[PDB]
Each structure stands twice: as C-alpha cells, then as structure tokens.
C-alpha cells in the first residue's frame, strides 16, 4: 500500500488498546481557562444562544470526488468566522486599519476569508437597517408613554443615510420636546442609581444610539459609552441641538447594551425596559443572529412532584 | 557488512554494554561494575532485576534511535508538503496521529533524548505556522494558543501538544563528556501567559510499569 | 510488541548465569548486523526445492 | 469439541507470560 | 376532542383567560411533539382558524417558540416548525406582523440552503404559503431575490425537492411574474426543459402548467423553438410530454402563433417528429375546444 | 379521592 | 419598579452570600417578576430561574405576630433571617419539617 | 491552589521541571506542608505508582525541612488512615513511603509508628508494610536492609517491629516477615526467643 | 550570562530562546 | 463580489470563483 502506517507495530483486536487520552481533553479545557475563558474568544455571545450545552456542529453532498474544484473553503471559513473576535482583535502590530464596506467593522490587514464571511453577513445595508429598527422602536415607546413622560413632542430627525456607520462624529437621532421643563442631573451610566436631576432644565432632549462590533481586546461597552459621550458632546462638529442628552451603546458581536448621559425623571426605568426588551424582541437583531448562525452552521439540539427533587443537597429558594 | 554492523564488548575496562534494538538505543550498566554512584531517577531508566535473587542488578538507559527521529521528522515533512488542498482539521488530524504513534511507541526514551524534545518543538510549531499561513497572517497575537488546542467540540482544532515543555540545558562541554546534570531550562513554544499547557507524555503510561502491571494482572486472573 | 522484545532481551541478558563478573577475564560481546540483502539473492530453483521439504 | 474459547484463552496467557 | 369541538361549533364564547391558557397549552403540545403526526398540526390549524383575529399579543411568543424549534439538531422538529409556519402563515400577517412576518420571510430565505430534502420541501411549502397571503409588492423581503435563488435548485435531481421547487416556482410565475426579468424567465425555461424526465408524473404535470404561466409573461417564439428540438429526441415520455407542452403553450398564447410552426415542422422527414406534430394537434384540439 | 385532597393540601390543580 | 427593586436586592444578596449558601435554582410566586431578576442576576448566571407552579402561603406569614410586628414597626429597609424548624430537624426530617410547615402555612392562610 | 498545582504537574515532563514551575510560581509560605501533602494526594489518585510524585515531594523535602516534618506527620497520618484506601491506593502509597525511606527522604526513625502486634495491626496495614518492605528489600537489596534493620541506633523505633519482650506478638510478627520471606532477621529474632527461656 | 546554555540564534527554532536557572537545583 | 454571479445568479467558475458568490 502506498501509505505509511504509524501503528505498524500493533493491532487493536489482538493487543487490546494500549492508551486512553480521555483525561487530556478535560485537563486541556481546565488549562485554557474553562469553557467560559474559552468562549470569550469566540463569536459565542453574538449568537445569543442561551447557553453552550446545546451547541452542535453538523453531525459528502455529492460524488464529484474527481472534479478540479478542490478544497471547498467552507470548513476553513467556519473556523475563521467562529474565532473572529480573536483573529481580528484591535491591539496588533503593523496593520493598515480600514473600515469594512458598508458597516462599522475595522480590519487591521487582509484576512480575505474572514472579510468574505463578514461581508456576506452584513449584506443589503443591514447595518443601517438595524439602526433604523432600534431607533423606531425607541420612538414608539415614547409615542406611547407621552402621558407619564411629560413629553409634548417626539422628533425623529430624518436620518442622514450614513450616520449609522460614521464612527468619528455624531448627528442625533432622538429629539424630545418637553411640555414645560425637565430638571436634569449630571451624566452617569445606565446601571447606577444615585441621580439628583437638579443641575439644569430644558424642554429639548437628545438621544443617540451607536453600534459597534467588539472583539476580544475591547468589548467593554461601559467605557465605550463614557468615552464616546464625553468626546461627542464636547467636540465641535457633532450637531447636537441641545446640551442635554444620552447615548445608547450597542455591542452587536457580544449583544451587549448600555448608555451614558444626563438623565431626567422616568428615563432610567423607561429605557432600561426599552433596552432589555428591544435587545430581545427586535426583528433586525433577529436577522443578524440568524445570519451569524447560518454562517457558523451551529444548531441547538435543545427542544422547548418537584419537591422530590427539591429538599436535595441542591439549594433552591422560594420567593 | 562491517560498516552496517556494530559490535560492543564488555570487559574489565568497559562496564557499559550498549546495543540498538528494534527502535531503541539501550545501554546496560550493572551495579557490580563502576557504579559507585547510583541513582533511581526519571523513567528513562529500567531497573533490571535478577529473577532468582530478586535484587536489582543493573540499569538499562534508553534513548530513541537517530533514524527513528529522522523518520518522525520526514513524516511531518510529508504531512506539510501534501497539505495545500486540505482543511485545517485534516492537517491537525494527521499531526495528531503521527505524534500519538511516536509517543505511545517510545514512551520513556523520549524523556531522555534531548534531541527529540527540540525536534518536537520545531515540528509542532511548523504545523501551527502552516495553519497561520493558511489564513493570511502569522502575527503571534492573532493566534493565541487557545485557537489551536481548544477541542473540536468548542470549535477549536484539537491539537495535541508536546511543545510547551521546558528543555533542560547544561554546559555543553561536560555534557559531551560526563552526564553532568541539569542547571538551566530553555523555553519551549510560546504561550500567551503562564497558561501551563498540558502534555501528552503525562497521560501515556510508561512501559516498565505496564510490564509489572501486566504480570500481576494476568497472574491473579490465572 | 517490539518494546516488550527490548525488555525481554535486556532482562534475559541480565539473567544469564554469572554474566557481569569479570574476575577471570571473561568478556561479553554483543554483535548486531543485517543480512544485507536477503530478498534479492534468493534463487528460485533452490527456493523451490527448499519449499518442497515443507509443503 | 467446543473449546475455541480455550484455544483463545491460553493464547492470551501464553502472550502474557514473563519468565527469565 | 378540542379540534373536533371548535371545528364544528366555532369559538364565539371563549373568553380571555380561557383563550390564553388554550393558546399556551397549544404551543406546548406542538413543541413537546415527539411523533410524526398531523395530530398537533391540525389541532393548531383549527384552533387559530377559529380564533380568527382574536389572537394578537402572543405572536412574539408563538414565533419565538417556532424559531427556536427551527434551530434544532434533529430534522423532524425542524420540519415540524416549518409546517406550523405554513399553517399560521395567514394570521401571521392578518395581525400586521411587520417585524414578525418580515422575520419569517427573511429567515426562511436563510434556511433555503438546507440539504435534508425533508426540511427543504417544507421550507418551500412555508414560503409558498407566505407568498399566498402577502402579494410580493408589499413584501419586506422580495421574491425578487427569492426566485433568483430558487433557479439553481431546479437542478436537484430528486423527486421530493423537485416536486416542491417546481410547485413554488409555479406559484411565483403564475402570480408574481413581474418582480423578475425576462432573462430570468428564459433561463428558468431552459431548466424546466429537463424536469420533463423526472420519474414521477406530478412533477411533469406541474412543469407543463408553469410553461403555461411563463407563456403569458414571455412570448413563446423561443420556447416553441426549444420544444421542437426536443421532439427530435427518442424514447417516448419525454417526446410525449413535450407534445403536451406544445399544446399548452398554444392554448395560453393563442393558437395562431404556434400553428404555422407546427405545420411547417410536419415536413422534416423523420418519424418521431411527424408523429409528435400529430399528437400535439390532438391535445391542442382537446384543450381549446369550441 | 386521595389524589385530589393531596393536591389541595399541596396547592392548585 | 418594585419588581426591579426585588431584583436588585436579591442580586446584592447573592453578592453577599459565601461560597456554600449561594442558591442553585430560584422559584418565585411571581412568574411575571422573573424577567427583572433574570436581568439583574447576570452577576451570578449560575441560577436556574423559575416561578413556582406550587403556590406557597408565605403571604400567610404576614399573619404571625412576630414577623408582622417587626415588618410593621420597622423604619429602615433591612434584612432578618428566621429558622422556622425550631426543634424539628432533630426528631423529624426536612421532608417532614416542610410538610409540617406547609400545613401550618395553609392553616393561617385560609382561616 | 490545587488547580494550579495539578496543572503545573500535568504540564511538565519530570519532577525537576515541575518543582521548578512551582517554585517559579510563588505562594504564601503557610501551606508549605500542605504543598507536599497535595502531591501525596495526587499520586494516591494516580494510574499506578510512578515515583514522579515521590521524587517531587522528595525534592521539596530536600529543599526545606518544613516538608520533612510534614512527611513525618504525613506518614503518621497515613498509618492512622491506612484502611481508608483500597488495595490499589494502598500499594501505591506503600511504594510511596518505600521510596521515601530508601531515598533517605523519610528517616528510619518512623518505624516507631509500627507495633507489630496482631491485635493492633490492620490487615490493611499488614499489606501496607508487606509492600513497603518487599520494595525495600528488592531495591536496596537484602544485605544493607538487614544490616540497617540490625543496628541498635534505631532499634528503639524498631522495637515495635521486632518483638522480644512480649512473646505472642513475637510469634505473630516473625511469622509475618517469614511469610514475606525475610528469613534472616526473623529467625535471628526467633533464636533470641529460643535462648530466652 | 550565556554560560554555555541556550541556542546560538533563537531564529528558526519555534522558541524565544529564553533561558533560566533551575530553581530546584539544591 | 463575483459580478457575474451577483447580477446573473451564475458564475462560470462555480466552486473555484475566488470571489464571493453573493446576490445581495
Ligand atoms: Zn463567481
């Protein structure tokens, strides 16, 4: 036979099986960091799959064994896209930084297979469409709760068709017209409570929503929101029609969300609701997550008295 | 032919009996002869035991043969040469099989051959480098270890490793003279932090223990 | 398997009788070689006759 | 007579012997 | 029971909380499904068929369920979720599901890449049963990209996927037909020309019907030329089915357009073709009648 | 029967 | 926002808990109030969240005089812990302690 | 800590490199004793005995006296908890302490913990000492073992092992080592017994 | 101090050639 | 963006088209 057998020296039927490497996989996982340290290097969170116990990667589609075509670039493409938060990080050595075609993705070089996957994922202007769906949903929430919010008017600035993927500046998307006056605090982040809405007052409110695409090196969206807010409000090109507002930061690759700005009464709970439900409900994000999944070819195998299980050594609380 | 042969005498001047069998390079040294200093140390050493007196009477030191290192290296060379029409996972399965077939055959001659350890470092890093070259970059930070060693279930490639061990070093002059010891630790392949990547050698069980194990297991089953 | 051959060889050498003793000037010799081409100088006539003794 | 699992039980005990 | 009951009676008096627990037990039954049965399908179809427009606020719930199922590992549940979409397709819209019916549109355009015929067929079914309710002009995702994606599937040489594909393309060429370009229809004509050799007769009848539908959209001066050249083939059962197709083209686009070419082809000195001409006139006079 | 009294001792049904 | 408060306080509690009292699954009367603590417990994503389909009259604990009075005339929002199995776990089981407990809860509940 | 120790072990190639990897790490010196104890535990859990863990714990003892007294207490602990194992774990820990002894890592005083009376001897401890002394004799050889078993300078500890005062446990212990096949010491002590009355 | 330890050039070796002293030497 | 594919749904190279088959 024209091939080389590296086990020329033994036979499994006759000699038994003289090694077992099943602890190697376990201890490899414990040394890389655990499944958590391992999947923070991946596109796992941008799939929004609830947890990784269901993951399943595609258990010949057809007899062209002969034809020139050759390697089908699909297994390599899937390995490359899956790992893309690490293969495409930010803190690198040499590499000429370039914005992707119609999106807000930065590459630091040329990884053509990765660029092809990422392009095919955000086709048909999906980046701006996501911006539109998010901002529409927020306007609608305000459209409804005008009553409690003291909001006379809500103004959706007909969008500059490239505000979504311009990363160095800001128009503003939401402008809120009060009834009488809002007394407004100093700026703080969407997850902190202590807010004394006393400093100034206005009828004009602006709200910003900005999309990024994080990577392993930098996916903290809190400091993104803080830094972007300070910069964008204290710059001299951003057309903000009021010195009062907030920016909403969305991380598409890790599906995170936060915000930073000057608040007024009712805003904190209001947008907290709006964010925690738009992240879940919006159909744009759904088309995203679905193209991500179909590019990975990931599937979930998951489908869908207790007190015999309840008094166990497992603690379970009754609220 | 005398040039392809090898004859080795043991007398009152040579205490060592060296030979070279199926793939191993062995050297027997009895305790009677010039071992005033004796140790029991790293498993490269079999302890032969006189079966009637049941006392350990000599030690066999093992190494991998030179043509077996060369055969492993040429095998990796043709993994790499015929891999431009294959996927990352096929290249890594061929590497996995080659390396398992070497490590499970030799198994403690590999500990004692300081030339293998370097061979294995360079060969594993050549496989990794060809996978990087497969993408269009070799930057050391686009490809931390986690990308290669993550199992095939979490989407990694699934490499098996023996290149993250430290290579012991000691003072070339006497090292070509008198088996001096180990004072320094050169570094193996480079991991993104401490990171302590596990090792194939620690999960395969040495021969000298498998043979005792087998003796007792079959004796008691009989 | 071959590693067990190496073990049995090392273990058989060591279990010879009075093998490591050098008082009377004994000498052990270990020779190892190769038949250098046996597959290539077989003679099919002689091989026929030598097989006929067996089968 | 029906003992090819004792013609395959000293093959193992013949393979697994170590005397010197 | 419930299915028999509400199917005979109607759902007039079913009040609020009742209908809630009902819709929810419904979702459960359908996920929990562990057999290949029309039981839970028909249950669902009937129950929403009777809820009519009363169901409204649970479309996130209902779909989210169906979609998570559409993600599953085993084919069967995937196929089930495709089915259930094809049932509730109409009410999906009629409650004005912009985000949600848009969802199902684009997400199924995604799954059009499957390779389990059993799921691919059901996906095609669900897409057809969406396009029936939503006429493509107001579609968020347009057949303008669907059908171009479908044409390279017509070459899939398998009875079930071929059946369902030609069904979907026949729907589109019947009613959509104008969100596509003449050139697209011409390529699809050239692909239909070799569905006429499938081993199943449903496929071949569907193929002939769609030649008819494409007959109104594009003048047949070229499709008829490509049919005569097929008459030159041998082996009878694809000659006879091209002769049916000629009859059909002539019936839709009036017979004076095709009669001169048929008659003139009656002069090529070969047997199979003179008999093809005669058999085609047979079918033609049957189809047109008075 | 014991099942129902058990359930109502226990909770809703 | 009261649900949100519930959420953040259980969040802070799990923060405060040592390594052997951290819960494993949490069940609340309010399956409508799962979403708030669902969000708020991401600091501790180890907990299988559920709303109990087995309604427990811990509302009937507002019947007792000690619990009542303490909550009633407290002024500062705070924490207290009670161990209802006063002497029970020594001569009967946690199974039996819970059975005893449920009967008492529903007893103060209904009448 | 145990995670990091197990991983440093399972990443190295020999006991020198693993000891280096541990000492190039740092810790608070408090758990120094528990350091050795842990490697002890690890080889208890092992496939079969490889003197790797022996060698590593022995190098730690070689590095500080803290691990030497740790090992005193550890042999005390395992003689207290010897039945707590299976015979597998029993034999590997037996060859553990046998390594320790013939490595000179554990001091031959330790035998004070071994009173070879039938009533106080676990059959589990019996098997323990049998594997221990099989290894000692077949490793250091019977001449220097019987020689070291002979000299008085450690006979105070050896007294529990070599019974002369009370006769019944002399019968029992001489019978035991005879069964193990240590004829020399056994019948010398039994000749002492014969001369006794 | 390149005291007869290490590589001439850590160049095509797959390593950074970093040397250290055996901490467990005593 | 293999422009033959994108505009006309069909690339003459098939599997070997070194560009991205995409009609979006
Ligand atoms: Zn192309």
Identify the CA nearest to A44 among candidates A219, A186, A198.
A219
C-beta of residue E161 within 8 angstroms of C-beta of residue E154? no
For residue A135, which of A292, A12, A22, A284 has the smallest C-alpha distance?
A: A284
In sequence order, what are the beta bridge partners of B55?
Answer: B50
C-alpha torsion E258→E263→E265→E270, nearest 10: 140
Considering only CA atoms, give the Rg of chain E. Answer: 23
- Whether J8 has its CB under 8 Å from any CB of chain A: the answer is no
Which positions in chain A touch C1 (Cβ < 8 Å)? 9-10, 15
C-alpha torsion E197→E202→E205→E206, nearest 10:
-100
Instruction: Give E72's DSSP letter.
Output: -
> Phi and psi for A175 in degrees, rounded to 5?
-125, 125
Pairing mode, strands B184-186 and B167-169: antiparallel
Contact F11 G103 (CB under 8 A): no
By Cβ distance, the residue of B97, B155, B210 closest to A82 is B155
What's E57's DSSP letter? T
- The whole-angstrom distance between C49's CA and the closest CA on chain A is 31
Measure the CA–CA gap between B17 and C26, rounded to whole angstroms: 14
Q: Closest to B172 (Cβ–Cβ): which among I4, I18, I19?
A: I4
HSE-CB of E123 using CA atoms within 13 angstroms: 26
Pairing of β B167-169 and β A174-184 = unpaired
DSSP code, position B52: T
Q: In Å, how far are A306, A307, G85 from G98, measured between CA atoms?
A: 13, 10, 9
List Cα–Cα distances, H60 to A27, B39, H4, H36, H44, in angstroms: 25, 18, 17, 7, 18
Half-sphere exposure of residue H186: CA atoms within 13 angstroms, side-chain side: 16
List the Cα angle G63/G67/G72 in 5-degree steps: 90
The answer for residues whose C-beta is within 8 angstroms of residue H91's C-beta and 6 or more apart is H49, H127, H131
DSSP C21: -
Q: Do C3 and B24 touch (CB under 8 A)?
A: yes
Q: Is the Cβ pair A276, G23 closer than 8 Å?
A: no
Measure the CA–CA gap between A181 and A204, rounded to whole angstroms.
Answer: 9
CA angle in degrees (0–180, nearest 5) for E210-E216-E218: 90
**Is residue H135 a contact partner of residue H95, using CB atoms and an 8 Å limit?**
yes
Q: How far is CA A201 from the centre of its chain?
A: 34
Q: How far is I21 from chain B (nearest CA, A)?
A: 4
As a dihedral over the C-alpha atoms of residue B149, residue B152, residue B153, residue B154, rounded to 10 degrees, the angle is: 40
Cα J11 to averaged position of ligand 1 atoms, centre (Å):
4
CB contacts, 8 Å: B121 with chain I: 13-15
Gaps in chain C with C–N over 2.5 Å, residue before each:
none
Q: Is E157 left (phi over 0), alpha (psi -120 to 50) or beta?
A: left
**Widest pairwise Cα distance in chain J:** 20
Nearest to B148 by CA among B167, B165, B133, B127: B127
State how far residue B146 is from chain A, nearest Cα, in angstroms: 6
Q: Do residues E118 and E75 make contact, with C-beta atoms less than 8 angstroms apart?
A: yes
Residue of A133, A282, A290 with shortest CB distance to E107: A290
Query: How many Cβ atoms from other residues are within 10 Å of residue B85's Cβ?
Result: 8
Q: Taking CA atoms, what residue in B is nearest to C26?
A: B11
Q: Which of chain B's residues have a Cβ under 8 Å away from the Cβ of I17?
A: 186-187
Q: Nearest by CB to B190, from I15, I21, I22: name it.
A: I15
Sheet holding B45-50, edge to edge: B17-20, B24-30, B55-64, B45-50
- E134-155 in b/e form (b: 16+ CB < 10 A) is bebeebebebbbbbbebbebbe
How far is Cα A231 from Cα A98, in angstroms, rounded to an integer? 22
Read out DSSP for B137-159? ---TTTS-THHHHS-TTTT----
Query: Which 8-state DSSP code applies to residue A6?
Result: T
Q: Which has the closest alpha carbon to A166: A135, A210, A136, A206?
A: A210
Is residue D14 less than 8 Å (CB to CB) from chain B? no
* Backbone Cα Rg of chain D: 10
Quick one: resolution in A? Answer: 3.3
The 3-state secondary structure of chain C, one letter per residue: CHHHHHHHHHHHHCCCCCCCCCCCCCCEEEEECCCCCCCCCCCHHHHHHHHHCCC
d(CA A31, CA A271): 41
Q: Do E103 and A283 touch (CB under 8 A)?
A: yes
CB B170 within 8 A of CB B181: yes
Region of A124 (left: φ > 0; alpha: ψ -120 to 50; beta: rest) is: left
Sort strands A316-318 and B184-186 into parallel, antiparallel or unpaired.
unpaired
Q: What 3-state DSSP class applies to G42?
A: coil
Nearest CA in chain E to A136: E99
User: Could you give the residue ranges of the DSSP H alpha helices within H64-162?
Assistant: 66-80, 87-102, 123-140, 142-150, 155-158
Name chain E's partners: 3 or more CB pairs within 8 A.
A, J
Question: Given CB atoms, is C4 within the 8 Å cutoff of chain A?
Answer: no
Q: B90 phi and psi, to 5 degrees?
A: -70, -40
Query: Nearest to residue C30, comparing CAs of G77, E276, E154, B20?
Result: B20
- 3-state SS, residue J23: coil
CA distance B160 to A237: 54
Q: Does H4 touch chain A (CB under 8 A)?
A: no
Q: Residue H80: phi, psi to the nearest 5?
A: -70, -40
C-alpha E188/C-alpha E171 separation (Å) is 14
- Cα(E96)–Cα(H33) distance, integer angstroms: 72
Residue of C nearest to B46 (CA): C7
In whole angstroms, how large is the CA radius of gyration of chain C? 19
CB contact under 8 A, B87 and A76: yes
| Nearest CA among H18, C54, J13 for reference residue A73 | J13
Domain that holds residue A166: 98-299
N-terminal to C-terminal alpha carbon distance within chain C: 29
Q: Nearest chain E residue to J5 by CA: give it.
A: E148
The CATH number for A207's domain is: 3.90.1570.40
Q: How many CB atoms lie within 10 A of CB B222?
A: 11
Mapping DSSP to helix (H, G, I), strand (E, B) and coil, where does residue E49 land? helix
CB C26 within 8 A of CB B5: no
In this complex, how many residue pairs, one in chain A and one in chain G, have their CB atoms less than 8 Å apart?
39
d(CA A89, CA B142): 7
**Dist. CA E41–CA E47, nearest whole Å:** 10
- For residue B200, which phi and psi values (nearest 5 degrees)? -70, -35
Q: Residue I21 has what DSSP assignment?
A: B
Distance separating alpha carbons of residues B72 and E186, to the nearest angstrom? 60
Query: After which residues does chain F show a gap where C to N exceeds 2.5 Å?
Result: none
Give residue E148 CA to ligand 1 midpoint distance, Å.
Answer: 15
């Amino acid at each position: 036979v024209l091939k080389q057998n590296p086990f020329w020296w033994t036979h499994q039927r006759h000699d038994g099986k003289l090694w077992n490497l099943n602890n190697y996989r376990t201890d490899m996982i414990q040394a890389l960091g655990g499944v958590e340290g391992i999947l923070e290097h991946t596109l796992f969170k941008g799939t929004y799959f609830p947890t990784w116990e269901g993951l399943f990667w595609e258990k010949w589609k057809k007899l062209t064994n002969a034809q020139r075509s050759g390697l089908n670039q699909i297994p390599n493409r899937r390995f490359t896209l899956w790992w893309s938060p690490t293969i495409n990080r930010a803190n690198v050595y040499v590499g000429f930084q370039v914005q992707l075609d119609l999106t807000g993705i930065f590459m630091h070089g040329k990884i053509p297979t990765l660029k092809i996957s990422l392009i095919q994922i955000f086709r048909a202007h999906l980046w701006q469409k996501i911006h539109e769906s998010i901002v529409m949903d927020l306007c609608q929430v305000f459209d409804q709760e005008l009553d409690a919010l003291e909001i006379e008017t809500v103004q959706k600035e007909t969008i500059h068709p490239r505000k979504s993927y311009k990363m160095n500046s800001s128009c503003a998307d939401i402008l809120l017209f009060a009834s009488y006056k809002w007394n407004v605090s100093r700026p703080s982040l969407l997850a902190d409570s202590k807010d004394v809405m006393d400093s100034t007052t206005t009828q004009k409110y602006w709200i910003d929503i900005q999309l990024r695409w994080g990577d392993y090196d930098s996916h903290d969206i809190e400091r993104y929101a803080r830094a972007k807010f300070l910069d964008y409000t204290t710059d001299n090109m951003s057309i903000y029609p009021s010195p009062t507002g907030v920016l909403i930061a969305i991380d598409l690759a890790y599906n995170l969300h936060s915000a930073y700005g000057n608040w007024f009464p009712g805003s904190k709970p209001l947008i907290q609701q709006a964010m925690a439900k738009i992240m879940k409900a919006n159909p744009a994000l759904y088309v995203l997550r679905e193209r991500i999944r179909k590019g990975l070819q990931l599937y979930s195998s998951e489908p869908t008295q207790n007190y015999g299980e309840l008094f166990s050594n497992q603690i379970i609380w009754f609220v | 032919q005398w040039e392809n042969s090898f004859v080795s005498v043991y007398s009152k001047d040579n205490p060592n009996l060296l030979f070279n069998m199926c793939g191993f390079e062995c050297r027997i040294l009895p305790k009677c002869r010039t071992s005033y200093e004796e140790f029991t140390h790293k498993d490269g050493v079999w302890n032969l035991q006189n079966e009637v007196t049941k006392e350990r009477t000599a030690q066999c030191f093992l190494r991998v043969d030179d043509e077996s290192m060369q055969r492993f290296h040429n095998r990796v060379r043709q993994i790499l040469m015929a891999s431009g029409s294959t996927t990352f996972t096929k290249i890594v399965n061929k590497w996995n099989t080659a390396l398992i077939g070497l490590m499970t055959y030799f198994r403690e001659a590999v500990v004692n051959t300081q030339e293998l350890l370097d061979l294995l470092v360079k060969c594993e890093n050549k496989i990794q480098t060809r996978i990087k070259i497969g993408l269009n970059s070799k930057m050391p930070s686009r490809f931390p270890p986690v990308v290669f060693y993550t199992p095939k279930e979490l989407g990694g490639l699934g490499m098996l490793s023996m290149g993250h061990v430290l290579i012991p070093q000691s003072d070339l002059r006497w090292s070509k003279q008198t088996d001096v010891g180990i004072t320094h630790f050169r570094s193996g392949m480079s991991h993104e932090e401490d990171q302590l990547i596990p090792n194939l050698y620690r999960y395969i069980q040495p021969w000298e223990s498998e043979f005792i194990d087998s003796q007792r297991v079959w004796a008691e089953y009989a | 398997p071959p590693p067990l051959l190496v073990y049995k060889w090392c273990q058989g050498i060591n279990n010879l009788q009075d093998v490591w003793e050098t008082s009377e000037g004994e000498c052990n010799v270990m020779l190892e070689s190769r038949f250098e081409k046996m597959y290539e100088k077989i003679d099919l006539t002689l091989l026929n006759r030598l097989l006929r003794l067996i089968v | 007579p029906g003992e090819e699992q004792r013609r395959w039980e000293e093959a193992r005990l013949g393979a697994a012997s170590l005397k010197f | 029971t419930i299915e028999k009951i509400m199917g005979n009676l109607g759902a007039a008096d079913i009040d609020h909380k009742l209908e809630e627990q009902l819709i929810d037990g419904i979702l459960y039954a359908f996920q929990e499904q562990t057999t290949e049965d029309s039981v839970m399908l028909n249950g669902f179809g009937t129950v929403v068929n009777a809820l009519g427009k009363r169901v409204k606020p649970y479309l996130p719930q209902i779909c989210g369920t169906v979609l998570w199922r559409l993600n599953n590992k085993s084919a069967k549940v995937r196929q089930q979720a495709a089915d259930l979409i094809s049932r509730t397709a109409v009410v999906m819209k009629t409650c004005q599901e912009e985000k949600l019916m848009g969802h199902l549109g684009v997400v199924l355009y995604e799954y059009l890449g499957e390779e389990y015929p059993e799921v691919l067929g059901s996906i095609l079914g669900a897409l057809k049963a969406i396009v029936n309710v939503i006429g493509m002009h107001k579609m968020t995702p347009p057949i303008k990209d669907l059908l171009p994606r479908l044409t390279p599937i017509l070459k899939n040489r398998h009875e079930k996927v071929q059946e369902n594909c030609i069904d979907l393309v026949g729907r589109i060429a019947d009613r959509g037909a104008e969100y596509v370009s003449a050139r697209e229809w011409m390529r699809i004509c050239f692909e239909l020309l070799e569905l006429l050799k499938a081993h199943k007769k449903a496929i071949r009848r569907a193929t002939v019907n769609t030649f008819g539908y494409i007959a109104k959209a594009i003048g047949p001066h070229d499709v008829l030329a490509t049919l005569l050249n097929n008459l030159k083939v041998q082996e009878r059962q694809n000659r006879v089915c091209t002769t049916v197709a000629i009859a059909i083209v002539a019936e839709t686009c009036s017979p004076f357009t095709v009669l001169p070419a048929l008659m003139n082809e009656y002069r090529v000195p070969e047997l199979n073709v003179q008999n093809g001409v005669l058999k085609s006139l047979s079918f033609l006079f049957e189809y047109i009648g008075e | 029967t014991q099942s129902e009294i058990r359930d109502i001792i226990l909770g809703m049904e | 926002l009261a649900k949100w408060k519930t959420a953040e306080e259980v969040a802070a509690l799990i923060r405060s808990l040592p390594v052997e009292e951290q819960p494993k699954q949490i069940i609340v009367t309010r399956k409508g109030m799962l979403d708030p603590l669902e969000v708020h417990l991401l600091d501790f994503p180890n907990i299988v969240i559920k709303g109990s389909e087995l309604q427990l009259p811990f509302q009937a604990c507002l019947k007792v005089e000690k619990f009542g009075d303490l909550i009633l005339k407290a002024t500062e929002p705070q924490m207290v812990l009670f161990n209802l199995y006063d002497d029970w776990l020594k001569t009967i089981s946690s199974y039996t302690a819970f059975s005893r407990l449920i009967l008492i809860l529903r007893a103060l509940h209904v009448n | 800590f145990r995670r990091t120790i197990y991983l440093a072990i399972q990443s190295s190639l020999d006991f020198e490199e693993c000891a280096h990897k541990l000492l190039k790490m740092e810790f608070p010196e408090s758990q120094t004793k528990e350091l050795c104890n842990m490697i002890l535990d690890c080889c208890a859990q092992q496939r079969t005995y490889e003197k790797f863990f022996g060698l590593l714990a022995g190098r730690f003892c070689m590095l500080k006296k803290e691990y030497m007294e740790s090992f005193e207490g550890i042999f005390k602990e395992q003689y207290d908890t010897i039945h707590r194992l299976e015979t597998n774990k029993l034999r590997n820990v037996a060859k553990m302490f046998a390594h320790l002894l013939y490595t000179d890592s554990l001091p031959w005083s330790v035998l004070e913990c071994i009173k070879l009376s039938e009533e106080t001897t676990t059959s589990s401890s019996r098997i323990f000492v049998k594997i221990f002394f099989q290894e000692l004799c077949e490793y250091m050889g019977l001449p220097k073992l019987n020689a070291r078993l002979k000299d008085e300078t450690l006979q105070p500890f050896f007294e529990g092992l070599l019974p002369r005062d009370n006769p019944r446990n002399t019968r029992f212990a001489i019978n035991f080592f005879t069964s193990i096949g240590l004829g020399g010491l056994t019948d010398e002590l039994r000749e002492h017994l014969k001369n006794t009355p | 101090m390149y005291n007869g330890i290490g590589l001439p050039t850590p160049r095509g070796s797959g390593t950074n050639g970093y040397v250290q002293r055996n901490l467990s030497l005593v | 963006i293999c422009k033959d594919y994108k505009e006309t749904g069909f690339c003459g190279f098939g599997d070997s088209c070194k560009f991205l088959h995409d009609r979006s």
